[PDB]
Design a protein around this ligand. Structure first.
Ligand SMILES: NC(=O)C1=CN([C@@H]2O[C@H](COP(=O)(O)OP(=O)(O)OC[C@H]3O[C@@H](n4cnc5c(N)ncnc54)[C@H](OP(=O)(O)O)[C@@H]3O)[C@@H](O)[C@H]2O)C=CC1
Ligand SMILES: NC(=O)C1=CN([C@@H]2O[C@H](COP(=O)(O)OP(=O)(O)OC[C@H]3O[C@@H](n4cnc5c(N)ncnc54)[C@H](OP(=O)(O)O)[C@@H]3O)[C@@H](O)[C@H]2O)C=CC1
Lengths: 324, 323
């Protein structure tokens, strides 16, 4: 009576071993580092009891139907959940596992890394070395934007947004602002952060860091209108989802001098075509969605995803279940 | 009128200070490019005051060029290893430099570099532009975290302290440091342990060098340093080029003896574009941009000018170097 499990990719070893040991399961896997096409996904999920997927696998009505009534648990190796058809998943009584907390510190780290390479202009500095542009120490050359006495606006002061604030505080940040559905005064206290409106966040911040979820509410949030309320000297950082940022409005505002610079960990689509105008701008840094990328973290998420699925398979509590 | 030579275009505020001085005759190297030693010797002849950069070589020949008039040298920098201090002392010439005003900015850059290096941002940046990016991937571009790490700081001075303070909320579990002498009061903020240099290499997951360049720091970071470091560790230098044995570093990185290196300084500066370290994907090199924010740089310009003026008029200087 072996439950079928499908894994949509080669995952870190700790998660792969935990599945392999599950003697009540047979594990079928997409043996590749490359994304599984949708029709190969539809083929592999057929009659699966459990699905172990990733943030870039689109788990829509099409693949839930391809799977049929066997499917009881979908374990995603990510904290983001927007790639999942939650309404349809709910309707069918299927359990969801995801990976919060476990990747928080690492992602916060990556966000501050990105904010700092962008704000201190490291990539064009690097290139001035390689291309022969460097001729000496120069007093007014490659001057960037410093965090001392600065105001930091965070859109979405969740666990990752809190961990980012905590990492920027010792940099001499004067004032923390934040935006969202409701205040979090218990959370914000640590930073003496102020709850403000989006327009006030834009007008007042030297640094804007977006660390919210993708919802209907957050889709297209940072558009022309937003970059226009921003300071000309401000730096814009997005580590959330690509669809939060209008990329045409971003390019324009970067190209026209409406903001100083931006660093993106996330894009629309992913990958961004090497062709994209964003990639031609020297005041734009784009990273390939590496927020949670250290082995230890990815090992930890992989094991968490495994254990979510196995418990979900056995009718047990999950280490980290997403409810309803 | 006291004669002044300025070896470069300095940021406005400081240049303004010098243009508003009625007691002074100011000559500038009117350029963003460094002064030939030959032009510097001509430039400084007769000068009472020299306002100079960390990259000008103020040796015997330039002091002798300048002559007995020379009363103040004011450098737009904190480092002083480009001044022949022994000769300056004995000639009784006063020195100005720029401590403190650049401490926060430089620490900021050093953590910038450590993070760009250890989270592999360059490699990442180019996987994007060169079409290597194909999806999100669980085992790809994984770097080295600060959580539960050991950071060794070589030189827990002003900047080394501002560095550790910025590193602490990243979850560092342990700070070690070394130097000539412990600094117990300053060490305490980080609970840092003073250890030898071999022990600091052996234990540290991340190594930051924020020391001054002296005869005893010179070539400190060499083959045997790199040999005792963890094969997983990351090496950052923001001090001076000459603290590092560059060949040993190249050798170490190319053979996997350490994980990677971020450098804000090299030997010589600029590093030639075909140099061996520029062929390694695990080596990040920045063009000595530690103090590069406009606001820090103007404050430096203004300091360097006021230190000069004050010396020229026999007054106490905002920041004099004690010789
Ligand atoms: N770059 C990377 O590799 C990674 C990226 N991420 C992304 O970042 C997100 C971080 O989530 P995490 O902190 O773990 O969990 P959280 O749910 O706590 O973070 C989401 C935040 O978004 C806020 N938010 C929701 N709607 C809005 C809105 N309309 N305007 C402003 N803020 C809003 C929420 O606050 P409120 O409800 O009060 O509005 C909350 O603070 C993930 O959902 C994921 O998409 C996560 C991990 C790694
Ligand atoms: N990349 C850049 O733009 C910048 C580079 N610099 C460089 O950084 C240096 C530090 O400046 P700052 O902190 O303001 O000056 P400090 O005078 O405070 O010097 C810092 C440290 O050098 C240390 N030192 C001397 N010898 C050794 C050694 N044997 N081993 C370990 N440490 C040693 C001192 O420690 P101890 O006496 O106990 O040995 C002190 O901790 C400057 O001298 C300059 O060369 C500075 C600013 C910007």
């Amino acid at each position: 009576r072996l439950m079928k499990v499908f894994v949509t990719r080669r995952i870190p070893a700790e998660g792969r071993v935990a599945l392999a040991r599950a003697a009540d399961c047979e594990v079928e896997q997409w043996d590749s580092d490359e994304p599984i096409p949708a029709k190969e996904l539809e083929r592999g999920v057929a009659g699966a009891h459990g699905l172990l997927c990733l943030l870039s696998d689109h788990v829509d009505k099409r693949i839930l139907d391809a799977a049929g009534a066997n499917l009881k648990v979908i374990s995603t190796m990510s904290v983001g959940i927007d790639h999942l058809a939650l309404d349809e998943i709910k309707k069918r009584g299927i359990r969801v596992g995801y990976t919060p907390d476990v990747l928080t510190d690492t992602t916060a780290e990556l966000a501050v890394s990105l904010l700092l390479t962008t704000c201190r202009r490291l990539p064009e500095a690097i290139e001035e070395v390689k291309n022969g542009g460097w001729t000496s120490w120069k007093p007014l050359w490659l001057c960037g934007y410093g965090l001392t006495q600065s105001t930091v606006g965070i859109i979405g002061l969740g666990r990752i947004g809190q961990a980012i604030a905590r990492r920027l505080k010792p940099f001499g940040v004067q004032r923390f602002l934040y935006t969202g559905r409701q205040p979090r005064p218990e959370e914000a206290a640590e930073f003496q952060a102020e709850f403000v409106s989006t327009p006030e966040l834009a007008a007042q911040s030297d640094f804007i860091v977006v660390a919210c979820s993708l919802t209907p509410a957050t889709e297209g949030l940072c558009n022309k209108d937003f970059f226009q309320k921003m300071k000309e000297t401000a730096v814009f950082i997005n580590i959330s989802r690509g669809d939060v940022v209008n990329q045409d409005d971003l390019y324009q505002a970067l190209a026209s001098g409406k903001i100083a610079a931006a660093g993106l960990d996330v894009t629309s689509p992913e990958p961004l075509p090497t062709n994209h105008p964003l990639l031609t701008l020297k005041n734009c840094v784009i990273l390939p969605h590496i927020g949670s990328a250290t082995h230890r973290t990815r090992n930890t998420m992989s094991l968490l995803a495994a254990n979510n699925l196995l418990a979900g398979l056995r009718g047990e509590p999950m280490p980290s279940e997403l409810k309803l």
